[PDB]
Amino acid sequence: GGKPRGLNAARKLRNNRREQRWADLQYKKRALGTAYKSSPFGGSSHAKGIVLEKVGVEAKQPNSAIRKCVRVQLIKNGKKVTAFVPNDGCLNFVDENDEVLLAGFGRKGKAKGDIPGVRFKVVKVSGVGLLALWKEKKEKPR
Amino acid sequence: VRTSVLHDALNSINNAEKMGKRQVMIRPSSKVIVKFLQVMQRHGYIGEFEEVDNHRSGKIVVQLNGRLNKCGVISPRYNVRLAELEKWVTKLLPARQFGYVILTTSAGIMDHEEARRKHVAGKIIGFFY
Amino acid sequence: GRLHSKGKGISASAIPYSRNPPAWLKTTPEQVVEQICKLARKGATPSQIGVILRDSHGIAQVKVVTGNKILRILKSNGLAPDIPEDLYFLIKKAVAVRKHLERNRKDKDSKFRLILIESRIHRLARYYKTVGVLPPTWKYESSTASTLVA
RNA sequence: AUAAGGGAAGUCGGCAAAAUAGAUCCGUAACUUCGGGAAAAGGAUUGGCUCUAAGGGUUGGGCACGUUGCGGCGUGCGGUUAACAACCAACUUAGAACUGGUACGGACAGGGGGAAUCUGACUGUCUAAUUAAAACAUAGCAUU
RNA sequence: GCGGGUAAACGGCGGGAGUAACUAUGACUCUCUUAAGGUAGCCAAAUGCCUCGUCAUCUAAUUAGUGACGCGCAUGAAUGG
RNA sequence: GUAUUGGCCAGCCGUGGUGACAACGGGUAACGGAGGGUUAGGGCUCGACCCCGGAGAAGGAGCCUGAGAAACGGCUACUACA
RNA sequence: GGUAAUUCCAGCUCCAAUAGCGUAUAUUAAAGUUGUUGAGGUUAAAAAGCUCGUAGUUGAACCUUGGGCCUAGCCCGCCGGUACUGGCUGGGCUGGGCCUUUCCUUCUGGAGAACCGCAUGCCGGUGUGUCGGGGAACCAGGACUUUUACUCUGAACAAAUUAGAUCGCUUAAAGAAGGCCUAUGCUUGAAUACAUUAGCAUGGAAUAAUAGAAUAGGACGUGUGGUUCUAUUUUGUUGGUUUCUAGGACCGCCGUAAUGAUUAAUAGGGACAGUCGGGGGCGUCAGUAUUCAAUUGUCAGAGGUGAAAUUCUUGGAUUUAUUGAAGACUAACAACUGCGAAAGCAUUCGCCAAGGAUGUUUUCAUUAAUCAGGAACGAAAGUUAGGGGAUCGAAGACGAUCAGAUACCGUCGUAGUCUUAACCAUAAACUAUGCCGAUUAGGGAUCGGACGGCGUUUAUUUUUGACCCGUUCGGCACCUUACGAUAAAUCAAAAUGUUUGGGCUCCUGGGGGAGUAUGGUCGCAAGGCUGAAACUUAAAGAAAUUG
RNA sequence: AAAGUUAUCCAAACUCGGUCGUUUAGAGGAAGUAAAAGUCGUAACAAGGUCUCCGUAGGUGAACCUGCGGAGGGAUCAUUU
């Protein structure tokens, strides 16, 4: 209650909606284009990078395990990120300087599960595909 | 200050009917109020009404007989075409069989059903069922 | 309620339904008009011209007896005041506050009242200009306002 | 007083010398006690000759009577020349053409500038004959 | 002589040991000690002996210059900061 | 002067024009439209791309012929490549 | 998931879609979590400290209604007859004509009807004819008509696309094709609606604005005078001149007429009368108390605490009576009471200007509501210069307590506490509840004004004042109830909201980072106003129930 | 009538200076978030053992303490001549 209701008050109603629309969080990040600027990916879906070293990451408080992440430097703009290697015993397939391909966890810029500070996962290594190697459908080229 | 005498009359009638009385008094009287009551009277929703004449504006005493659920007013008098008249009856009428939407046109104020017969349109001012 | 207040009083006067003089008046309309002009020349404003007639002898409503209002009657006889009386009294009160204010510099409450009174004068003067009672160039100058009252 | 090429490599130290300089028009930062800094920094023009335009002063104003050696006053009026005519007089400012061995504040006269530190607030004063300064004085503040 | 007041009066304003799941440091604690134990600030400064102190900047090369650090031989509040 | 109007340009003379009903300036991962996707109604979002209009031929300027070009599968000059 | 894993790695079995299924990013629905339709603001996120006011939005009622006849076009019911047809004094719907004081502008021309007679001819009607009294309607041309918004119907405007009609491409997404006996032939289709803002015409005349006669500068007349301009053809032709006549502009005299002004809002402003209040400013008067000082009498302790100590004392402390000075403050009366825009305001008297309510057969006539920017006031502490400095007491110094005590307790004590002239602009500035207007239920108390009444009291006494009973207008509040509202606590508003629209301004969108960084602006300073992002997280929070 | 030549106009390009925008190195200083067997106290929730909170000013290893003016979201809806 308290809106202008007259027949010639179309200017105030249109102006008010424009100003208060910024209080929304989903719309505010769309208008300013933060993804184009701050996100390591240039607003894209995938990216290619070079593996630097293998790192183990501890799980959060209730759990206890080693998550076995990896360090990657992006070819497109030279930034450095960390990515998670899914499935059981798959670090064995990746070596140093292996040209991996990455994607997201699907939480749209937030960490998934108990893994802290990790936002990406490895999809392909040496252009073969990680899951295909796991089921012994293909052999990794030398 | 008083900006819509029509709303005051319709609101006062609605309160008295909901509490079960039989008669109502309306302090200011105008042509639109009287022309509105006549449409309601011809459908049996009220009985006789009489307008006592003081020299300022006069008053009205209406006689109720039940049968009335609600009577409201739309404050911004929108402009409605003939083709879009079916949008409104879907909004503020309980059912298609009965109920009336009051319009004002160049041929006097009238309900939404005879206006279709005469093929006329205008402005919307209220409703009752 | 009130223009500048929070009160909501309803004190007023009730006009009788009848529009005809009482049978005991026995006074012609021409005599009343001549009676009005004599008092106006003595100095009375239209405000208390009516109350003298009502209280002292006879006429209760000048309009019913003669068909015209007091201010309309005076104008046709060349006796209308130069400025309307309602605006004249507002000017007179504003002058008296300024004279008192300069002697009592830090009376902060009376300073608040003066802003209200002057704000009421500007609103009322604008209405008179747009109807033609006052010339379009009329302005309320605080420096020379003291001459208008007296 | 002048010097090819280099331009402080000299020296405790740019000591001495050189460079800038008038007027008209553009442009001008940090900081600040909002007064300053400021001529900040940094650019353009300048002769001769033949022309054009602008900036002023003085005296004249139509009828109708009376005085007077073509006229000076007394007046009685009317009109505001859609501002005309004659004469007189110095300088200051702006613009155009042509011209030259591209020169012109042609001698004289005539500021080098910028980024920072230490120290006294400023103007002022003293060891005449080796020391002019951070020294003395000052307004302001406090005590007896 | 005995007893009070006064620092914009003259002037003054400290040492030794332990101690935090890698070293290091010491918020914390015991101890001697008197008129009080240098507070806010500031610094290799015209005030620092060791000293051409350590780090950065300026240069091909700087005992010089500037910005930081401070147990300061021997900075410091109208002897004014 | 131009195919013609026009402060389009040259002289002389006035002091104006836009703005809280948002001027001026900055952003656009901006060619505009017919239209695509998603739906109770009201809406939100996309449109380089077969149709219509505008602009460009590595970056800028200049010009010849001709009814029609400031053309680049036409010419001249500079800058960058070769 | 920590030794019998329905959740990992495997073997069986089963479920979902199926020539397809999974994953990442963008976008829509779900979202009434962006809310014009349609969203919260007492306590969960959120009403500016308060008032004035410009843009902007919004604004009370009133001017030709009704009635009486005729007639048409479309439906239904009924009757009867053969899907058809007629009728109902059929009842309805839409429309067109007349009289009621109203009806419908006007001139020229065109062609020509109806109603009329004229004579000529058939079985009381008719072509009669360049016959005339005569133009219903129609067409073309000229003049007059307050102006916008709104709606209805037309015109003009692109193909494709969307909706949609037709035809068995073997069905279908498509396509615009096809069909008939057999034909040296015939025949058809390639519709229609929508866009929608702006622009051009036509009918309607409710709703919402606007204009007109008040210093008459007003309307009308073949009434009657003037002075100015223009000049068609007629007197052969041209030029010059005049009269009459026709038109326009302007100004007099006379006549005609019902000669021209809507209410006075339980809207608003102003005036008047008797009052009321701890509202504001300046001056002045009074009260005890605390501290200090002087005089006076006596003699050993006084202070303070749960208990002690520091401190003061025969240089007479503490206590007792009289007198003096200084600064601050107004006890009891004092309350579910009063005034002010809020902050706030309490001893007496004098002066100065202001305000609410009530009363009224005064006056003006829409002058009004809320407000982006803008402006006035704004406790306490704090800041700049003077005056004052009794009491309390930030900082500071000591005594105890305690393992420690930079505190709570005790003795001292600086700025400050008060006032004049200028700054500052923030509070749990709270009713955590914005402003105007309407309606909705019972009750008893109370403050201010008016009106009515039976008595008591009382005075140089009546009328007035005090007390009692009842009605009414305006306030600060309270009790019961729930037809209502909410998650609940609870509420006469927090009600009249899924059956949702009386007007207007401001603010909020999960929790942190954060009222922080940076830029701007105001200030002497302390600081005020405006106000992000990176990053991080699955819960914070409100009301009530059992332990 | 070709080469050549005089004076305007349209003007690419380079040099120097000013100004605006984006990205990025830096001794040292001061914050935020998370993690972990850390050290020192016990400020808040009961009258949390000095009732809690708001504006302002000062002080202290740290939570915090004290002065002045407010609020009840309190531990009181209440005391008579």
The CB density around residue A59, as the number of other CB atoms within 10 Å, is 14
The CB density around residue B22, as the number of other CB atoms within 10 Å, is 12
Which structure tokens are listed for C63?
A: 């309009």
| Chain A residues closer than 8 Å to B75 by CB | 5
Listed as ranges, the nucleotides of chain F within 7 A of a protein C-beta are 21, 29, 41
Q: How far is B71 from chain A (nearest CA, A)?
A: 20
Residues B61 and C99: their CA atoms lie apart, in Å, by 57
Name the residue with tokens 């819509």: B4
DSSP A48-111: EEEEEEEE--B--SS---B--EEEEEETTT--EEEEE--STT-GGG--SS--EEEEE-SSSSS-
H or E element, residue C39: helix C29-42
Residues B99 and B113: their CA atoms lie apart, in Å, by 10
H or E element, residue B23: strand B23-26
How, if at all, do strands B122-128 and B71-73 pair?
antiparallel
H or E element, residue C20: none
What are C's interface residues with B at a Cβ cutoff of 8 A? 15, 17
A72 burial via Cβ count (<10 Å: 0-12, 13-18, 19+): buried
Residues C123 and C119: their CA atoms lie apart, in Å, by 7
A87, A81 contact by CB (below 8 A): no
**Torsion angles phi and psi, residue A20, rounded to 5:** -75, -10
How many residues make up chain B in this entry? 129
The CA distances from residue C115 to C50, C91, C111, C118, C141, in Å, are 33, 13, 7, 5, 15
H or E element, residue C32: helix C29-42
Of all residues in chain A, the one with the smallest CA distance to B79 is A7
Instruction: Give the end-to-end CA distance of chain C in Å, rounded to a whole number.
Output: 33
Residues C91 and A38: their CA atoms lie apart, in Å, by 67
B92, B80 contact by CB (below 8 A): no
Please report, as a single letter, which amino acid is at residue A87. Answer: N
Name the residue with tokens 């006009």: C15
H or E element, residue C149: helix C145-149
Model resolution, angstroms:
3.1
- B73 bridge partner residues: B126
Listed as ranges, the nucleotides of chain G within 7 A of a protein C-beta are 1-2, 8-9, 23-27, 33-37, 39-41, 47, 51-54, 56-63, 93-95, 150-153, 203-208, 261, 263-272, 279-282, 341-342, 352-369, 376-378, 421-422, 434, 436-441, 473-475, 483, 496-497, 499-510, 533-537
Chains B and A: 3 or more CB pairs within 8 Å of each other: yes
B8, B25 contact by CB (below 8 A): no
B54, B46 contact by CB (below 8 A): no
How, if at all, do strands A80-84 and A120-125 pair?
parallel
B 69-128 residues inside an 8 A Cβ radius of C: none
Q: Coil, helix or strand for A6? A: coil
Q: Coil, helix or strand for B107? A: coil
Neighbours of chain A (3+ CB pairs under 8 A): B
